Amino acid sequence: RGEYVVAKLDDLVNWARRSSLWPMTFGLACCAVEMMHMAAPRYDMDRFGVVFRASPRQSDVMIVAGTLTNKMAPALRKVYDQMPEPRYVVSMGSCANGGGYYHYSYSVVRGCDRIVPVDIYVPGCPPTAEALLYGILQLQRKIKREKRLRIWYRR
């Protein structure tokens, strides 16, 4: 039946997307250091299929790791625009989540969500590299639960 065929196509495409999540080298602050430590041998992003890649044209997930300030927010929004779809935003740290320590400052965006649609909120100051890996795996399951071709079949 057509539903089974589109189901299997959904599983294949979602598996590819979740098993080759290519992130972006967009570290901003101390939350980037853990972003490096999970790339360090101990946790090693590489075994999970995730390999760092600059040039947003060839990346899927943006881990906004660090404080997002007013002077940088236009750059972050523009760079998010460069990403071809599908795209995902993982927010690392309290600063990139809702403001963190400098939530009441004059030149800090009170949450990265106000600029891009954040897909996964990873809490911490900074989050432990295990916690960030957990957030990435949660995003992976999110991609696994996508129903693109199913919705197309029931257009």
Partner 1 sequence: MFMINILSLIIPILLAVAFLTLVERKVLGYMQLRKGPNVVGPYGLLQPIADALKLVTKEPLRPGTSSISMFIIAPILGLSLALTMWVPLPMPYPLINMNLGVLFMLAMSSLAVYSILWSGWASNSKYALIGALRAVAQTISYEVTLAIILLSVLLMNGSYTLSTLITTQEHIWMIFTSWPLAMMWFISTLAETNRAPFDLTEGESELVSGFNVEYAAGPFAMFFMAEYANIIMMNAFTAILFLGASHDPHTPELYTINFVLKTLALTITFLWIRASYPRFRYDQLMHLLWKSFLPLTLALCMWHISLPIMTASIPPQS
Partner 2 sequence: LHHALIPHGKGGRSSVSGIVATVFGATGFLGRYVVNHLGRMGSQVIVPYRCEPYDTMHLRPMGDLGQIIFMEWNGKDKDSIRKVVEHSNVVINLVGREWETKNFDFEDVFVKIPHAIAQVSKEAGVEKLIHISHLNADIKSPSRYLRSKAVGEKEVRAAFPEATIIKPSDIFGREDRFLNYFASMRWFGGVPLISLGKETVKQPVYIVDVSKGIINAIKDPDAKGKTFAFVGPNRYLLFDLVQYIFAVAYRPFLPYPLPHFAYRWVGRLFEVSPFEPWTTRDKVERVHMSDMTLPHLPGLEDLGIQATPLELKAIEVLRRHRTYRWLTSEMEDVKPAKTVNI
Partner 3 sequence: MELVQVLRRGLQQVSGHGGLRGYLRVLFRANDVRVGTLVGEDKYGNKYYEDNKQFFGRHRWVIYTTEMNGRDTFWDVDGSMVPPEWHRWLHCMTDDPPTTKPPTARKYIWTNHKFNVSGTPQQYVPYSTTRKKIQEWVPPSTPYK
Ligand X SMILES: COC1=C(OC)C(=O)C(C/C=C(\C)CC/C=C(\C)CC/C=C(\C)CC/C=C(\C)CC/C=C(/C)CC/C=C(/C)CC/C=C(\C)CC/C=C(\C)CC/C=C(\C)CCC=C(C)C)=C(C)C1=O
Ligand Y SMILES: CCCCCCCCCCCCCCCCCC(=O)OC[C@H](COP(=O)([O-])OCC[N+](C)(C)C)OC(=O)CCCCCCCCCCCCCCCCC
- Residue 94 in contact with residue 124, Cβ under 8 Å? yes
Cα separation, 70 vs 60, whole angstroms: 24
Asked if residue 42 binds partner 3 (CB under 8 A), the reply is: yes
Coil, strand or helix at 89: strand
Q: Taking contact as CB under 6 A, which single stretch among the options 10-18, 69-77, 93-101, 136-144 is the one that binds ligand SF4?
A: 93-101
CA angle at 33 for the pair 32 and 36, rounded to the nearest 5°: 90
Of the residues 13, 134, 146, 153, which one makes contact with partner 3 according to CB under 8 A: 134
Say if residue 59 is exposed, middle or buried (CB neighbours under 10 Å; 0-12, 13-18, 19+). Answer: buried
Scanning 6-14, 25-33, 96-104, 138-146 for contacts with ligand X by CB under 6 A, the matching segment is 25-33
Residues 8-47, mask of contacts with ligand Y (x by CB under 6 A) = -x--xx-x--------------------------------
Interaction site with partner 2 (CB under 8 A): 86, 98, 111, 113-119, 146-148, 151, 154-155
